[PDB]
Structures are given as C-alpha cells and as structure tokens.
Nucleic acid binder design. Structure first.
Ligand code: K
Ligand code: K
Ligand code: K
Ligand code: K
Ligand code: K
Ligand code: K
Ligand code: K
Ligand code: K
Ligand code: K
Ligand code: K
Ligand code: K
Ligand code: K
Ligand code: K
Ligand code: K
Ligand code: K
Ligand code: K
Ligand code: K
Ligand code: K
Ligand code: K
Ligand code: K
Ligand code: K
Ligand code: K
Ligand code: K
Ligand code: K
Ligand code: K
Ligand code: K
Ligand code: K
Ligand code: K
Ligand code: K
Ligand code: K
Ligand code: K
Ligand code: K
Ligand code: K
Ligand code: K
Ligand code: K
Ligand code: K
Ligand code: K
Ligand code: K
Ligand code: K
Ligand code: K
Ligand code: K
Ligand code: K
Ligand code: K
Ligand code: K
Ligand code: K
Ligand code: K
Ligand code: K
Ligand code: K
Ligand code: K
Ligand code: K
Ligand code: K
Ligand code: K
Ligand code: K
Ligand code: K
Ligand code: MG
Ligand code: MG
Ligand code: MG
Ligand code: MG
Ligand code: MG
Ligand code: MG
Ligand code: MG
Ligand code: MG
Ligand code: MG
Ligand code: MG
Ligand code: MG
Ligand code: MG
Lengths: 197, 258, 163
RNA sequence: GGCUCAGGACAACGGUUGCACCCCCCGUGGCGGUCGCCGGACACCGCUGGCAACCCGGCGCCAAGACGUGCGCGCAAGGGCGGGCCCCGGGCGAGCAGCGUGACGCAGCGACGGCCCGCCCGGGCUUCCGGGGCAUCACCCGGUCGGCGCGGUCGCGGCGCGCCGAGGGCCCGACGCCUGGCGGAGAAUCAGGGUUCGACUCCGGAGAGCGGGCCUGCGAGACGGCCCGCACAUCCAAGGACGGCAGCAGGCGCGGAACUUGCCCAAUGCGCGGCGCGCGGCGGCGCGACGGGGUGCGCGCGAGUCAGGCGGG
C-alpha cells in the first residue's frame, strides 16, 4: 500500500486507521523517532511501525535503514524456545521515512473522540477492591465478599485474610518458638552433663 | 557423560539381587536415601519379585500409593526406595513384621519379629564430628544424625534407637569378645565373636572372628557390626550364621527333592 | 576460551603430545580483575552456584597493629612496593602481598602508651604507616592487611631507601 | 536413554591409591535465634496492523506456590592475634577441626519458612604396575627441568605471567615417523607351551559435515540449543528467509558384501503421576550361523484343509 496509520486513543479506549501517500519527499513527519510529538496536521506520538517486508522498528538503533542485532531473551521482536537462547534478527525499517508501510500512533490532549469502550475485566486482588470502593485496607473485618461484578471466564478474590489462614500463620509461629525452646533445653542438658563428667 | 546416571542395565545390577538375565533389558535403579546403591535392595524387588503381593510394576505402584507399607514406622510411596540392613518392614493389613538381615550367602532375608521388638533399631556409629557453632554430631550407617551424644559413644560402636522418638536408649562398645556379624565382603551374613584387632598405620585395620562352631575368619573393620554383648540384641535366622561347605550344602540340596 | 587443561603441554622428555578431545567447560579460566586503588565489586556465578566477589576500585581496608593489637579501618593511600613486578607499583594495582602506605589518622589515638614500638610511633607521628595486604581482592572483593614490624619492616624500609 | 569408531600410541584403558588441594540436583536424617497482610506488570485474551513467507508491531482491561521490597532474638565469605623453643581428645598415622578476642562487612533466609549440615550417587584430577611397529629414525627438548611471587580456577599444579638458575630424557631404545590403531571384559584355534583378532550385546572413552565461541542451568564447551568462518544443499514476487539421519524406517552413491517408509506402551525401565517415550516390546524380510524331526514300516502316520480352544495390546 502506501502507509496505514494505526491511531489508538487510551483516554477512551478506541482504535482507528487511516492512509497517506508518505512518499519520498518533504513530508514534515520524516526524520522523527519513536516516542516523539508531532502535530498531526497530515493524519500525536509515534510508538512503532512495520516497513515493507514487515520488519519492525526498534528503539535506539538511530538509523533509517534495517539492521541486524543479537536479540536476547526478554527483549522485543523475539519469542524464544529455550531459557537462555538468543537470536540474530533484522529490524528498524526507518526512523520514520518513506519506507514504512505502517505507523503506530497515540493521541494526547485531544472523527473527534466519541466512543467509550467498557473494561471487560474487574479488579481481583483484595486491595484492588478496597481502592475501588474507598474501603480502608487495615481492619479486623476485611472479608469483603460482595458479589456483583455485573455478571461479567473470570471472580475469586485473592489475598484475603480469613480466620483459618490467620490460625495457620499463628500455628506456624507457635511452633517456630517451640523448636527454639526445646533446643536451648537440650544445649543446657549437654553442658551440665559435661560439667558432671 | 554430561551428568548423573538414571538407568541401570539388567546385567549391571548387583549380583546379590538375584535378577534373571532374560525378561528385561533394564533393572530398577535405587533412589538415593538412607542406603547406597550397592548395599541395598529396591523396595519393589521385595513386593513383586519375592512375596508376590504384586505381580507387575504398575500394580506394585498402587499398593504404595494407598500406603500399605511402613519402613521404620513411616509409609514410603516410592517403588525404588532403598531398603537395607536392619530396616523394619511391617505390612499392617497382612500383619507381617520383618527385620532385614543377611543370609549366609550374602543376600537379604526377612526375619519374622514380634510386636515387642519392632519399636527399635540398631545403627553403627560411622563418625563423630563438629557441626555448626561447634556442636558434636554422630552419623550412622543409615544416614542418621544425632546431636549432643553421650561422650562415651565412640566410632564403631552400635546404638539402639526407639523408632518413634528417634532417640538413643542403649549403646554397645566395640571390643574383644563381642558378638558380631559381617555386613559385606565374602564372609557376609555369618555371625561370630571378635578375637583380634590389628591396626596398620596408614592402612586398613583387620578383624579376626570365630564362629560358634569355632571356624575362624578375617575381614576389614569397615564390615563388622556389633549385635550385642555375648548375646544378640535381636533375632537372627534359623541357620544362626553358620555357613556349610559345598559338600554339606549339596547333601541338603539332594535331600529337598527327596 | 581460556583453559588450564594440561593437554596442551609437552611431556617431561620434551615430546609433543596429541589432542584427544575438545575444550571442556570445567577446565576454564577467566581474566584477572586488576583491582585499582581509589567502589565497585562485581558478582561472578561459579560452578554449582558459589558466588565470587571480584573487586574493582577499592579505597579502604581494615588494618591491625598486631603487637599492641590496635585494629582500625583506614584508607589505603599508595602502593609502594611489589615483589613480582615494578609495573604493578607504577599503576597502584591492588594484589595480595603488596606493600602500601595507609592513613595515619585512625591510629593517632595510640600515640600515648610507651613501651610501644618507636618504629611504629614515629610512623604514626607523620602522615602514613607502612602496611601489607593479606587478602585476595579478586576472589573475595576485599582488601585488608596488617601493619609491618620486626625484620620485615626493616627489609622493606631498606627496599624503599631514598638511595 | 539411542547411534557410531573419525580422532587420539608414556593418551585412552585395566587393576591399585589419594584429596590434610576439591564440586554435587534429587532422596534420606538434622538443624531452624538474624545489626503487622505491600507494590505494579507480563503473557493468554479483546481492538486495530505489516509481510510473498519466515516472523512480528501498537493500545488496553486481569492472577499467582512468578517476581520485587520486606515484619525477625545479630552472624555468610574473607582478615589480625591467641602451640609446645630430648623426640615423640571433637578427631587423626600426621597441629587437624572448632572456639575466644580485637576490626571490617551486611550477604543469604523471611508476603504459604529455609538459609545451613551429614550421608548417598555422580564427577574432577591424582599414586604405583601394565599399556603397537620401524634404527635406511641416535641423539632429543628450550615453559623445555627446578625455585621464588602473584593471578586464575570448584580446586592442586609451568595452568598462566614476572624474576632467578641449567636443568630434564636416552641402546632397560629417548626423539621422530607410520598404523586400512578405540581400550578392556573377551573371541577363533587346540596334548602341554602357544598364535591371531579385539567394528558391534556389558563397562570406560571420544564425536555429531569441519574449525572455533557461548548462554541457561546442580550438572553441557549440548549440536532432534544458540553465534561466526569454510565446504555443500533448500524456498522466493529477487526484497529476504533457511538446513545438519554416526536416531528409527527409507533413498542415492560406493562396494564382493548387508532387511519393513509395519503395530503397540500390554511387558522391562525412565521423566513428571497420568500420561509420555522408533528406549524397549510384537509381527514382517532373513539357507550368516545353531538345534530337533522326515522322504517308511509291514500298515499306520506327518505335511497340508476346514472348525473349535489356548495364546496374544
Ligand atoms: K540456551
Ligand atoms: K558415551
Ligand atoms: K547431573
Ligand atoms: K542426567
Ligand atoms: K541387560
Ligand atoms: K538382560
Ligand atoms: K542389555
Ligand atoms: K529411579
Ligand atoms: K575453556
Ligand atoms: K564441562
Ligand atoms: K545403525
Ligand atoms: K576410533
Ligand atoms: K541432576
Ligand atoms: K593418576
Ligand atoms: K600415576
Ligand atoms: K595413574
Ligand atoms: K605406567
Ligand atoms: K625400529
Ligand atoms: K621464559
Ligand atoms: K607458579
Ligand atoms: K614465567
Ligand atoms: K630461564
Ligand atoms: K623404538
Ligand atoms: K579404520
Ligand atoms: K595349549
Ligand atoms: K611359541
Ligand atoms: K596355552
Ligand atoms: K601346537
Ligand atoms: K553388528
Ligand atoms: K559402541
Ligand atoms: K563398545
Ligand atoms: K554397553
Ligand atoms: K556403558
Ligand atoms: K559410558
Ligand atoms: K559409548
Ligand atoms: K562425548
Ligand atoms: K569431530
Ligand atoms: K558439525
Ligand atoms: K565438528
Ligand atoms: K562444529
Ligand atoms: K564445534
Ligand atoms: K559436570
Ligand atoms: K568453547
Ligand atoms: K564448541
Ligand atoms: K529424516
Ligand atoms: K559410521
Ligand atoms: K522399524
Ligand atoms: K553398485
Ligand atoms: K552392484
Ligand atoms: K509399557
Ligand atoms: K530426574
Ligand atoms: K521399534
Ligand atoms: K494320519
Ligand atoms: K492333521
Ligand atoms: Mg536452557
Ligand atoms: Mg549417552
Ligand atoms: Mg566435544
Ligand atoms: Mg611513579
Ligand atoms: Mg638460563
Ligand atoms: Mg578391545
Ligand atoms: Mg570392541
Ligand atoms: Mg551397526
Ligand atoms: Mg542429544
Ligand atoms: Mg557442539
Ligand atoms: Mg558391487
Ligand atoms: Mg523335534
């Protein structure tokens, strides 16, 4: 094609697409790098893109051509098969130039932003449901088994301090003291024994 | 290789296991635990190969999943668990309690024992050493560890351990005239009395013993286990550690088909 | 890479010996720290785990005047002598056994007692004391030492004579 | 675990020692004292894309037996002093291991309690003896032989580096060269003494087209892991991407010379616990070779045929 511009607005949650000539000449967008502000009068912040042959941009390479790189496990553009495996790959079609067949862009500080997408998933951690509802996260009645969720597979709150779990922890501590007490008694017995001998 | 061995070919298995050379390429490899590879028996080789409570490997597993077997008072759910000398072997649902000893041909046998006897174990003191913050420890032939032992216990003595508390109630000193049994070599399994201890600076110390019929034999000090003081603290097989010669063994064999 | 395998040496009669395998991992060596004076310590994973500390750019140490038993923490000022090579003194490289000049301030509270070596009290009266490193900085990441005395002190004082 | 025998002749390998110069997952005993319930974000997944295909990009809601930080009776590594000036228990044949005391340091274990210690198996090196042929290969070596000091290593060591000395080996065959050279347990032959061969079943070693390099891990210098050079092939829109049967079958080539592109985890065992597995098992081809019985006897059988058993996943 020429250039598919994937715009994405996180303030509301939408995604839109456009097109542009993006040919070899002036193009006031050319010469910008990933994570840069432009004024979007021809189509805002660049965040990625694929060129022709579908090679993805990579942050920091500071070139408008492709490059090889030894990519390491944990880094972008690589999915490893064994722990500790690396791989040499090709990247970065441009710092945005005429080559790119795609751009990725995000909108800051607002055709116009209209749609508001719902959040599919609800908070799950026990504190995650106390910051939502303004409840304190410090009490002796933290149970919080309100079940609404608006029937929206996902709930099963985590990190809840129940009564039996409290008993479990207290039991482990009460045994971690018994060990030390019996150990000190045995040490005393042995010292007294050698004293007698 | 590049790492540890996990297999064991059938022809390479220890010869006192009495494994047969057909019916398998592989043999079970004993898991690490209280006993070493050479001087042990995998637990499966008793339940399937010997007593026929199980008849295959897969159905030998299910007996040990539902915990019908106790070793030294604990249920072992592992088929290649190493059981060995002096381990208590008790199957409750059949009410069988055994003690694992050697016969007069260096093989493991099970000796029936009473409920008044299966609550204790004899161990051999292998070493005394200072651990953490300078505390004394003793180690046994079962990979057992005891802190603060009484100062009289020295190496090559044997100790008697209750099988629920895991503590010491009795000890026997290694001396002249003590009753003893040989745990390995080529006099393995027979029982006698110590009549000599010859130390060689730098090298092995040899022990000379004499049977109850007066036959004398020799071995290394790393192979003599004290079972009491002129009277064995435990029960022993019917042969009582007397080994026949090949002619008398042959006449007893001729008499079985007779 | 670097190996300390003996398969690459000649025999004791001078004969060349053949190669019967490729390089094994357990026979590797690494490059030396070349610890500099005047603070980083890197971590090295070793066989079985067993972290090694490898120091670069140490400044201080803990030092002991053994005879009177005065132990303080002091700053190492200069490497002055080394047995192996004078190249290791010119660069102030910290290795085991090198002779250094350390700061006299922490020990000035030891100036009062007499029957204490005047060959140490006069050292303290100035700006520095001669001392010797006793640890391996490349293997444990630390540089501690003791304060010289006896015939050793005199041997090194003549080695550094103004001649 | 399976395959192979290319390399390598004071190696490797076999018996026999040692580590008071060492490292070690799981399992089995121990031990457990450490100057009030936290945070945010990644994948699967939604919405959009690039590309021939290999493979990837952007934005966003979400967990933990994952991380990260941590509530705690001070104690990880390393370091200075604490020995007797014929001769000789904590534990030794052997001054070894702990502890005390002055200084540093602040590690590891703690958000479902484990750092640490003994054993066990396994590994690394290491003592003594054995360990191919050629003299038309008689002298060979120069980190070569020893000493001192540091570095590096899991660890000792010319293992490496600086300095010092001139050593070390040899007709009891050094050094060099050659081998259509893997070692042993063993096998063929046969009075006794011997000769010849050790591809392949067990044990040990080495390799994965040939050189090298490395990450992750307790453990690999791994090739059914990654990176580079070389020699060879593979797809393609020409921009790129990409390979290693000395695994099981199967094919080409070569040679005098060597089988099915089968069925199955039911057994023997191994990993996780219920599965997995061309380990291995069962059939197929198979005059390499072994063992038994026939082609008659004076009148009854076997080889085949068809059924039912038994056996077998
Ligand atoms: K890897
Ligand atoms: K091998
Ligand atoms: K291993
Ligand atoms: K392994
Ligand atoms: K076998
Ligand atoms: K077999
Ligand atoms: K076999
Ligand atoms: K096993
Ligand atoms: K190396
Ligand atoms: K290695
Ligand atoms: K083959
Ligand atoms: K070979
Ligand atoms: K392992
Ligand atoms: K050796
Ligand atoms: K040797
Ligand atoms: K040797
Ligand atoms: K030899
Ligand atoms: K010759
Ligand atoms: K030199
Ligand atoms: K050296
Ligand atoms: K040198
Ligand atoms: K020289
Ligand atoms: K010769
Ligand atoms: K050959
Ligand atoms: K003969
Ligand atoms: K002859
Ligand atoms: K012969
Ligand atoms: K003959
Ligand atoms: K063959
Ligand atoms: K082979
Ligand atoms: K072989
Ligand atoms: K084998
Ligand atoms: K083998
Ligand atoms: K092997
Ligand atoms: K092999
Ligand atoms: K190998
Ligand atoms: K090779
Ligand atoms: K290769
Ligand atoms: K190769
Ligand atoms: K290669
Ligand atoms: K290679
Ligand atoms: K290893
Ligand atoms: K390498
Ligand atoms: K390599
Ligand atoms: K293939
Ligand atoms: K081959
Ligand atoms: K097949
Ligand atoms: K042909
Ligand atoms: K032909
Ligand atoms: K099976
Ligand atoms: K395993
Ligand atoms: K098969
Ligand atoms: K017939
Ligand atoms: K018939
Ligand atoms: Mg890995
Ligand atoms: Mg293998
Ligand atoms: Mg190799
Ligand atoms: Mg200068
Ligand atoms: Mg010279
Ligand atoms: Mg051979
Ligand atoms: Mg062979
Ligand atoms: Mg073959
Ligand atoms: Mg492999
Ligand atoms: Mg390789
Ligand atoms: Mg032909
Ligand atoms: Mg027949």
């Amino acid at each position: 094609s020429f250039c598919k511009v994937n715009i994405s607005n996180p303030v509301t949650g939408a995604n839109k697409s456009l097109m542009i000539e993006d040919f070899r000449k002036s193009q006031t967008i050319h010469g910008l790098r990933m994570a840069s502000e432009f004024d979007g009068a021809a189509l805002f912040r660049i965040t990625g893109g694929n060129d022709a042959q579908g090679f993805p941009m990579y942050q920091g390479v500071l070139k408008s051509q492709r490059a090889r790189l030894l990519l390491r496990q944990g880094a972008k553009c690589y999915l490893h098969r064994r722990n500790g495996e690396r791989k040499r790959k090709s990247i970065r079609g441009c710092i945005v130039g005429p080559d790119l067949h795609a751009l990725s862009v995000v909108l800051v500080d607002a055709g116009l932003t209209d749609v508001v997408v719902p959040k599919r998933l609800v908070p799950k951690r026990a504190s995650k449901i106390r910051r939502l509802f303004g409840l304190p996260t410090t009490k002796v009645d933290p149970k919080d088994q309100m079940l609404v969720c608006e029937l929206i597979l996902k709930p099963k709150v985590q990190r809840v301090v129940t009564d039996e779990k409290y008993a479990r922890k207290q039991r482990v501590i009460a045994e971690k003291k018994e060990i030390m007490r019996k150990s000190l008694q045995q040490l005393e017995e042995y010292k007294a024994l050698l004293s007698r001998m | 290789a590049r790492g540890v061995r996990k297999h064991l070919k059938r022809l390479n298995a220890p010869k006192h296991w009495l494994l047969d050379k057909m019916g398998g390429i592989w043999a079970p490899r004993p898991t690490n635990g209280p006993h070493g590879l050479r001087e042990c028996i995998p637990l499966i080789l008793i339940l399937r190969n010997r007593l026929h409570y199980a008849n295959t490997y897969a159905e030998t597993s299910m007996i040990l999943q539902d915990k019908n077997v106790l070793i030294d008072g604990k249920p072992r759910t592992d088929p290649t668990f190493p059981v060995g000398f002096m381990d208590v072997f008790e199957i409750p649902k059949v009410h069988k309690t055994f003690r694992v000893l050697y016969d007069v041909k260096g093989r493991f046998t099970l000796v029936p024992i009473q409920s008044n006897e299966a609550g204790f174990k004899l161990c051999r003191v292998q070493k005394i050493f200072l651990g953490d913050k300078g505390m004394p420890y003793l180690s046994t032939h079962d990979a057992r560890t005891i802190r603060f032992p009484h100062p009289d216990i020295k190496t090559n003595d044997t100790i008697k351990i209750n099988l629920k508390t895991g503590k010491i109630d009795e000890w026997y000193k290694f001396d002249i005239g003590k009753i003893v049994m040989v745990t390995g070599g080529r006099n393995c399994g027979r029982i006698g009395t110590i009549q000599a201890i010859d130390k060689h600076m730098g090298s092995y110390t040899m022990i000379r013993m004499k049977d109850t019929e007066g036959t004398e034999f020799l071995t290394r000090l790393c192979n003599v286990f004290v079972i009491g003081n002129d009277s064995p603290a435990v029960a022993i097989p019917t042969t009582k550690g007397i080994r026949p010669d090949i002619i008398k063994n042959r006449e007893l064999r001729l008499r079985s088909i007779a | 890479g670097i190996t300390h395998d003996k398969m690459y040496k000649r025999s004791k009669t001078g004969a060349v010996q053949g190669k019967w395998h490729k390089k094994r991992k357990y026979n590797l060596g690494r490059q030396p720290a070349n610890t500099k004076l005047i603070q980083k310590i890197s971590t090295i994973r070793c066989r079985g785990g067993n972290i090694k500390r490898r120091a670069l750019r140490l400044s201080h140490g803990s030092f002991a005047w053994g005879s009177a038993d005065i132990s303080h923490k002091a700053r190492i000022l200069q490497v002055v002598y080394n047995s192996t090579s004078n190249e290791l003194v010119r660069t102030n490289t910290l290795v085991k056994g090198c002779v250094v000049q350390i700061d006299s301030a922490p020990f000035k509270s030891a100036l009062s007692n007499d029957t204490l070596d005047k060959e140490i009290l006069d050292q303290i009266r100035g700006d520095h004391i001669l001392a010797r490193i006793s640890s391996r900085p490349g293997q444990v990441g630390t540089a501690d030492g003791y304060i010289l005395e006896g015939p050793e002190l005199l041997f090194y004082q003549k080695k550094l004579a103004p001649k």
